[PDB]
Design a protein around this ligand. Sequence first.
Ligand SMILES: CC[C@H]1CCc2c(sc3nc(SCC(=O)NCCN4CCCCC4)nc(N)c23)C1
Ligand SMILES: CC[C@H]1CCc2c(sc3nc(SCC(=O)NCCN4CCCCC4)nc(N)c23)C1
Ligand SMILES: CC[C@H]1CCc2c(sc3nc(SCC(=O)NCCN4CCCCC4)nc(N)c23)C1
Ligand SMILES: CC[C@H]1CCc2c(sc3nc(SCC(=O)NCCN4CCCCC4)nc(N)c23)C1
Ligand code: NA
Ligand code: NA
Ligand code: NA
Ligand code: NA
Lengths: 396, 396, 396, 396
Amino acid sequence: VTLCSPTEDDWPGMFLLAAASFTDFIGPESATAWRTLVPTDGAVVVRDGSEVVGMALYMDLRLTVPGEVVLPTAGLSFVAVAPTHRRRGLLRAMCAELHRRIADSGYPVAALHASEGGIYGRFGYGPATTLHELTVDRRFARFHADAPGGGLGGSSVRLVRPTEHRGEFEAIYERWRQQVPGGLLRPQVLWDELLAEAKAAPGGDRESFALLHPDGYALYRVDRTDLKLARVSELRAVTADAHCALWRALIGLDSMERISIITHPQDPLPHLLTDTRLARTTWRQDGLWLRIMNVPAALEARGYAHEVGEFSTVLEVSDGGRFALKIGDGRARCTPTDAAAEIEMDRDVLGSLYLGAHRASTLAAANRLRTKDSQLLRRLDAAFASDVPVQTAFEF
Amino acid sequence: VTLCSPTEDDWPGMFLLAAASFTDFIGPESATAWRTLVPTDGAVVVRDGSEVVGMALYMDLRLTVPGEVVLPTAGLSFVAVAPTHRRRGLLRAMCAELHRRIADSGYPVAALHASEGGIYGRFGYGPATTLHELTVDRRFARFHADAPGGGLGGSSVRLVRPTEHRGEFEAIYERWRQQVPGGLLRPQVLWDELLAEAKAAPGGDRESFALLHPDGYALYRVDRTDLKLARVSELRAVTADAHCALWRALIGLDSMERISIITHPQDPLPHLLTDTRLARTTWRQDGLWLRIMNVPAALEARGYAHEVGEFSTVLEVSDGGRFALKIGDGRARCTPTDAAAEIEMDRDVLGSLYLGAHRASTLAAANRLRTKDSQLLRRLDAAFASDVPVQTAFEF
Amino acid sequence: VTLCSPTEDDWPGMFLLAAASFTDFIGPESATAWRTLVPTDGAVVVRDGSEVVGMALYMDLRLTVPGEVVLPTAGLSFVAVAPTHRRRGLLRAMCAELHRRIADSGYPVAALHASEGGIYGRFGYGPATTLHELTVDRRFARFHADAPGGGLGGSSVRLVRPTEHRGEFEAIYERWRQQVPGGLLRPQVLWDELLAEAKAAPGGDRESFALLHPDGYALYRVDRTDLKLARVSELRAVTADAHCALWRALIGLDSMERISIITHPQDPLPHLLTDTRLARTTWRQDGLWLRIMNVPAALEARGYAHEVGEFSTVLEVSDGGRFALKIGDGRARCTPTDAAAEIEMDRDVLGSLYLGAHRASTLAAANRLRTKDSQLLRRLDAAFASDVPVQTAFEF
Amino acid sequence: VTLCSPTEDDWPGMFLLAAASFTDFIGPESATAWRTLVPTDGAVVVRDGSEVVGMALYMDLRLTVPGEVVLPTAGLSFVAVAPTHRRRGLLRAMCAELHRRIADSGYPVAALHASEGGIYGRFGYGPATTLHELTVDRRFARFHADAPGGGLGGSSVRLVRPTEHRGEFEAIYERWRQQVPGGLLRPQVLWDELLAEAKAAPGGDRESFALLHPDGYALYRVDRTDLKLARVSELRAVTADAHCALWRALIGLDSMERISIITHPQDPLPHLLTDTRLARTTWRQDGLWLRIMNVPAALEARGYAHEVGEFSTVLEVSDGGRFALKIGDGRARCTPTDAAAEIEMDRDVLGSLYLGAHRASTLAAANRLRTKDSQLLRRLDAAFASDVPVQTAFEF
Ligand SMILES: CC[C@H]1CCc2c(sc3nc(SCC(=O)NCCN4CCCCC4)nc(N)c23)C1
Ligand SMILES: CC[C@H]1CCc2c(sc3nc(SCC(=O)NCCN4CCCCC4)nc(N)c23)C1
Ligand SMILES: CC[C@H]1CCc2c(sc3nc(SCC(=O)NCCN4CCCCC4)nc(N)c23)C1
Ligand SMILES: CC[C@H]1CCc2c(sc3nc(SCC(=O)NCCN4CCCCC4)nc(N)c23)C1
Ligand code: NA
Ligand code: NA
Ligand code: NA
Ligand code: NA
C-alpha cells in the first residue's frame, strides 16, 4: 500500500469508493462542481500494490469567526477506507499527510462534518457548532404581542420559485455569512448545486419553494412521506424583522401540521410565540468540527468579548506548544514561552472553545481543560464567548 | 361564585377536583405530607353558589439564585378549574388573590412548574430553568483518557438501598442545593415521600437503587416496560470527581442498553466520553418558572458576574416600576426613577433572565426585551450570566 | 373453458394475467429473457369460451442433488388463475396436464418456489430447502481467534462494480452450483437479467456493489428505506477461506448498523464471531419445493451417506408405486415389488427427504412417514442426510 | 478484594446485588426454594475490603445426554459483578474458583443459560441446545389428513387447573426428562415454584391453564398485553399421539389469533398442518451451554449413533488433554496419548458437539474444529448426532 496525490486515472476508482462509502452520494456530475474547490495538491489516495482502497481531500473554504474575521479554512471531505482495508492505519496515514500539506500551505484552521462522533477527536478536531432541530406544531402557534411585523398593511415576504431569484438569495447569504461565526463563503458552483436540488425528482424530493424578504429568505419543501411536515432546508435572516416575518409566513402554511428546521441553540423562534414550548427540540448533534492548525495565528485572529478586563495566562496545548496569552480590549496576543503552564488542554478542546459553542467551565468539569485557578476559568469563559451566536452554514 | 380561603370542610371537594385534574395524583396521604409546606393563608378555593370548582395554593420554599443567595419563594401548586367552569375567569381571579397575599407576605419571588407552556406568561411567569434529557447508549460508551477516576484500585461508589442511607443522601443534597442556582431546600416530609416512592409497586414502578459516593449520589430504576432502559430520577454531585465516578458506575449497568437522565444543558457528561454524540438529547422543556414579585428586592439579592465593568442603566418592567440599575463588583443597586427608560421588558422576561438560563440578547432578538443600545445588551448578557450553571431541583 | 398450448396470439393475454397476478412482475422485456428457458410444449393456457383466465409453464433447469449429481428438472413457474375464475378446478387441470408432459418428456423431478405454503402439497410437491435470514449487528461483531484470514498483509477481497467482472462471477457460480445440493445452472440470459438489476432505479433499488475473492463473491446493496441496513442478495463461496474473507469485508461496511442475508440453516457465519448470538435468525421459510416424477430414477440418481451399512427395505409412495430399496456404499437400487411395504409416505414427503433438508424421523413423528421399525427410521435418516448442506440457488 | 464462600451474614448483600443485576428477580422467598439445590460449598462471593461486589454459585442438577444417560451436572447461576467493580477480573476469578470446586467434586460437566452470547465461550462453555420460537396463526391452521387423533369419538385431552393435577404433571415430566437429551430432573421445590407462577398476579401475568393427556401436558396463558396471543410456557409429550392431541386442543383456542411456543428445531408441529408455513419461526437463540469438565468421562458416558462403523482417532482439546478416541457399537473409549492429534478444538466446541445440536462439519467450516481428514469429519458428524432431538428442559 502506497500513499500519493491521485492522477486523473485514479478518479474512477475514487468515485467507486465514494458510491460504496456514502449513501447520500450524487454521481460524478455534482462531484465535478465540488471538485473545483479542491486545490491542486488537496487530495491523497491509497492504492493496494492495483485499486483505490483509501482517499481523503480538503477544499479551500472561508470561515467566519467571532469579530467578523474570515479565515482561510481547509475543509476535509470525501474521506473513505474500503471495507476490505479496515484496521490497517489508512485513515491515520491519510490524515497525517493532509495535515502536513494543510499546515505547510499556511491554513490556520481545518474543519469537517463528522460521519461519527468518536473518530476525529484523536486527530485534534473538536465539535465547534451545535445543530438544534426545532419542530413547530403550527396549528397552535400564536405570535406574542411583542413579536415584530404584526401590524396592518402589506406583507414584506413573497412566496417565489428559488431559480427565478438567485441574485437576491446570493446577496442575502453573502451578508449573513460575513456577520455570523460559522458562516462560510458559498461559491457560484455551490449555488448551481443548491438550485438544481430545488426541483422535484421522480420518486424523490418534492419541489422547493422560497419565502423572500429584502433582508432574509427561507428555502422549504414538503417531506417526501409525511405530507403534513414542511422541512426548512435553510433560513438566512440578516435582521430580527426578517427572521420574524419569515416565521409568520412559515406558520401561514395552513395545509401543514408541523414546520421543522435545523437551526442553532440561540434561535429566538420560541420567544416569538405565546407558548415557547410549541418550538420543540426534536434533535441535537455536533455540526462543524475544527482542528486549530496554528495555535497563535488562530488565537490572535479572532475577536474576544470587550466586557472582560485585560488578563494574562500561559496556555499549553498537548503537543501544540506553550504560549503567553494576553487578552484585552477584545484582542489576543499569543507568544512562545517556557513559563509554567496555568491552563492545559488537547488541541481538539481548543477547537471546541474557538467559536464560543462550548464553555471552558463545562470542558473543565470533564477534566478536558486543566487549571487550578477558578478565576482564570471565569475569564476564559467570558473572553471566548461570542456576542453573535455561532451558526452552521452548509454541510460539506 | 365566591373566592375564599378553604375551611377544613372544603378539602374533600379539593381532593376530588385534584383526582379529576391531575393524572399523576397520589391520594390524600401524600397530600398530607405536602400540605405541611402550605402556610395558614396559602390556599384559595372557588365555590359554585355548593361545591369546589376552582383551587390554587402556594408552598413556602427556599430557592438558591446566582451568588449562592437563598430567597424565600412562594411555590404555586395544586391549581385546577373544574371542566364544568372553564372560560369563567376563575384562574385569573385565583392568581390575582394569591399574588396579592404572596406580595403582602414579603416574598420577593414566586415559582411554578407549568402543565402547559402558554398559560403562565400572561400572569408574569417566565421559564427560568431548562430540562435536558440525555439518553446514553452505554454499550458503546468509553470514558475519555482525561476523565477522572480511571486509575487502578478500589471504587469510591457503593450500590446501596436508598432507605438504608437516608442521612447521607440528605447531607449530600443539602450541600448541592446551597451551591447550585435552581436548588431548593428539601424538608423532612419530602424525604419521607421520596424514599416511599423508592420501593416497587405491584403493576407499578420497579425497585429504585442508589449509587453512593462521599460527594454525590444517583437514584435510578429500570423502566416499567422497557427492561433495557435505566432511568436516573436524580443525580446530585457536589464535585466533578463525584459526577464522573457516578457515571462510570451507571455505564457499568451491563444488563442495560440505555441510561436516561433529566439534567441541565451544561451537564459535562458528553465530554467524559470518547464519542460526545453517544449522550443524545432526547427531550428539552422549560423546568422552573419565576414571577419576580418585588423587582428591586430580587435584582439587589442575586450576585452578578465580576468580569463585567461597573455600568448604570434605567430598567422599566411593564406595570412593574422603573428603576436606576447600577451593577458593579458583582452587586446591583436598584432604586426608583422617572428618568427615561434605556431597557423595557414584561415581568415574565425578567423571570427568564434571573437565573441566567436565557440570554438578554436572545430575548432582544424576539423583541421581548427592548433597548436601542447594543453595548448595554452585551453588558446585561454578561452580568446576568451564572458562573455555576442553573439546574432544576425537584418538581412541585 | 378449454386447455391448450398457447399460440403467439395468447401471450399478450398471458402478460396481462401476469401483471395482475404477480406484484414483483417486470414487463415483457425480462419475460423474453426467461421465456428462452421454456421448451416448445412447456406452457398451457385456459381460455374462457375469449380471453386467458389461466396459465402455467415449466422451464428446463439443471438441479444439483447429493453426490454432486445434476438432474434435468422441470421448473414450474408463471402459474396464475384469473380472480374471475377461482374455485373452478383450473389449477388442478393445468398441473395435471403439465405433469403429464413433464413425465412423458423424461424429467425425473419437477421443482417450484411456492407463493403460499398450503397449495402444492396436494400435487405432490414437498418443501426441500430452507431459507434462513441472518441479520448481523456489525457494530458489535468481532471475529473469533480461530476464524481464517485474520493475519497481517493485504486483503484477498476487492470491492468492484458487478458489470465489470461478469466472467469471474460466472466461473465462481458455476463451481458453486456443481458442488452444492440445491445448486442450479444459471444460463447467460439470467446473468444478463442479474447484472441489469445491479444498477440503481429512480425511486427504486440503490446501486449494487460486489466483494470479489478468487473463490467467492458477495452481491449487496443498501436497503431502499433503511439506510443503515445492507442486504446481501447473493453470497457464493467455494472455500471456507472465501466465505470468511467475504464476511470480514461485509463487517467492514462501517456506515451500516446491520448486514442481512437469506442463507441456509448450516451457514457457519455465527461460529466465525466471538458472540454467536449476533448472527440473529430474523426469518425462516420453505425455499425450493420438489415433486419426484419418477421414484426409482430419482432414488437411484442421488448419492447416499457412506457411514450407514448396507440395508434393504420396501418403500410404498401413495399412488407412486412400491419398490425394493437397497442402499449400500453410498448408492441405491430401487426395483418394482409386490412384497409387503415396510415404509409408506405420500409423494410430497419423498420430495422433502430428497435433498436432506428434512429428517425421516421428524416426518415420522408427524405420521407423514409410516413404519413400525425404529431401526429402519434411523437408517433412512442417516442414508438420506447430505454431507454438503443443501442451499437455495435462485428463485424462479 | 477477597474471594470466599459466603457466611449467612453475606446473603442480604447477595440478594441486593441480585435485585440490582437481574430484572426478572423474584424476592428472597423463591431464592429460598432454589437455594436448596446449592451444595454446601457451591457459592463464592467477592467482598470490597465491606460489601458484596461479586457472586457466583452452582446447583446440583441431573442432565440427560444421548443414549438416555443421566450425568451429575453443576448448573452455574446467580453470577453478578456490581456495576461499581467492572473490568477488575472478578468474573474470571469467581469462574476459576467454582470450576476448581466443580472439577474436584467429580462433576463431568457444568451448564448455564447465558445472559449474553459473548461472555462464556472464553471460560470453555459452548451453546449445546437451540431455542426455536414457533408462532401459529391458528385461524388458518388445518390438520393434515395423516396427522394422528383426527377420528370421531371423545377427546383424550382435558382442560384443567394446573394446581389440581400436580402428581400427573410430575409423572409425565419425569418420563420426558429421562428420554430426551437436554432433559433435567425437576425437584419438588421447582414444582412448588412452577405451580405458584400458574396463578394470576394483580397488574402481572394472567391465570395459567393446562391441557392434560395421559402421555403429555401443555401449560399456557394469554399474553399480558396481546389478548389474541396464547403463550405455551411448557409442552412435554412422551408420545407423537400426545404431541398431536395437545396441538389439536391448542388450535381449538378459538378466541386466540396466535399460539406461540419456545421449542426445538426438530418440533414436528409444522408437518401436522396442511400449510407448514403457518408454524413461523419468530425467534432463535442458544439455550443450554455446556462446559465439559472431564473430557474422557464425558465422551465415554454418552451413547453414539450405531449406524457409523467403528473408527479410531486422536482428539486434542486446547489445554484439555490429548486422547485416543475409539467409537464403535454406539460406545466410546477415550484414553490418554502423546500420538499426533488428528482433530483439534477448544473445550467450548466439544460442549457444542456433545448433545448433537451442532454438526462437527459446521464448526470445521468456521475453523473452530481442525482436521485434514474430511472422512473423519463425516464420521464425527454421524457418531455425535442424536437419534432423539435435543430439547431444553427449564431455564436456571
Ligand atoms: C471529487 C471532489 C469531491 C469533493 C467533495 C465532494 C464531491 S461531491 C460532494 N457532495 C457533497 S453534498 C453536501 C453534503 O452534505 N456533504 C456531506 C456528505 N458528503 C460526504 C462526501 C461526499 C458526498 C456527501 N459534499 C461534498 N464535500 C462533495 C467530490
Ligand atoms: C393539600 C396540599 C397540596 C399541596 C401540593 C401537593 C399536594 S400532593 C402533591 N404531590 C406532588 S408530587 C411532585 C410533582 O411532580 N408535582 C407536579 C404535579 N403535581 C401537580 C399537583 C399535585 C400533584 C402533582 N406535588 C405537589 N405540589 C403536591 C397537596
Ligand atoms: C414468458 C415466459 C415466462 C417464464 C417465467 C418468467 C417470466 S418473467 C420472470 N421473472 C422471474 S424473476 C425471479 C423470481 O423471483 N421469480 C419468482 C416470482 N415470479 C413469479 C412469476 C414471474 C414473475 C416473478 N421469474 C420467472 N420465472 C419469470 C416469463
Ligand atoms: C440463593 C440461591 C440462588 C440460586 C439460584 C436462584 C435463586 S432464585 C432463582 N430463580 C430462578 S428463575 C428461572 C430462570 O429463568 N432463571 C434465569 C435468570 N435468573 C438469573 C438469576 C436468578 C434469577 C433469574 N433461577 C435461579 N437459578 C434462581 C437463588
Ligand atoms: Na456580526
Ligand atoms: Na456555588
Ligand atoms: Na460437493
Ligand atoms: Na430416548
